[PDB]
């Protein structure tokens, strides 16, 4: 129909330290299966 509130795009809220909390866990375990800050997270190429 229309807008009667405020122009505010949709957004998601994650905590700032949680993503580092899970990071150190997978990182430490990743050192076993894969060669051991050499870990790089990059966006997908696309398509």
């Amino acid at each position, epitope marked *: 129909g229309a807008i*009667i*509130g*405020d*122009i*505010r*795009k949709a*957004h998601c809220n994650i905590s700032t330290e949680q993503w580092n909390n899970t990071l150190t866990q997978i990182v430490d375990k990743l050192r076993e299966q894969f060669g051991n800050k050499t870990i790089i997270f990059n966006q997908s190429s696309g398509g």
Partner: antibody
Amino acid sequence: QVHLQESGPGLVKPSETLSLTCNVSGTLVRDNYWSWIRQPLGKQPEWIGYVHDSGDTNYNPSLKSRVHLSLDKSKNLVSLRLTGVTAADSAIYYCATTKHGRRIYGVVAFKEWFTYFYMDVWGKGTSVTVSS
Amino acid sequence: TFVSVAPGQTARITCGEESLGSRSVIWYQQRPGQAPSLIIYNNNDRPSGIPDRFSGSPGSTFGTTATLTITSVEAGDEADYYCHIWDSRRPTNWVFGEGTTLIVL
């Protein structure tokens, strides 16, 4: 105690590059923002806008044709100049300071805030009229 | 746009359009033959030099209209009142609204 003095010839010929001046009182122009207000005789005031050195030289969007604001740091003077005065320019003008104000209603990074200005003090002004 | 209120009574002033979005209303007054001044510098915040008698509506209203409530009108209240809306929807409006000239008997 804040007071200021203006100038003007009183009678201005049509189609003349009229110039107006406004001085300061104690406060320097570098650390302050100035605004001009035009009020027709007996009607609601009209806001020209605000001018400030180093980038903040926004003018009135409605006119954006002949308005020209300049500053003189050495003389501590601000000048207002119009080119091609018309018959509808007969109004009282006011040069005065303004104060900022912030409001946020959304995400800090998505530009949901607009600065609003309020004039704590107002100038004495000088009458300008056009005749033949 | 002329309002007649007897001394010592309550007064209501209506200014601005419908509340499509949030507002930050600024209230101004004009004295005949004297420079203007300020009363309220925000939606509800006020500067020094004036008591808490003045009141206003918050800017979190949708579909309503900005209003001003004045009580215990005195002899010094005779002045022209102007409103300045500040909406996030429309650009900054450089023309003030219909000034309400409040006269006291």
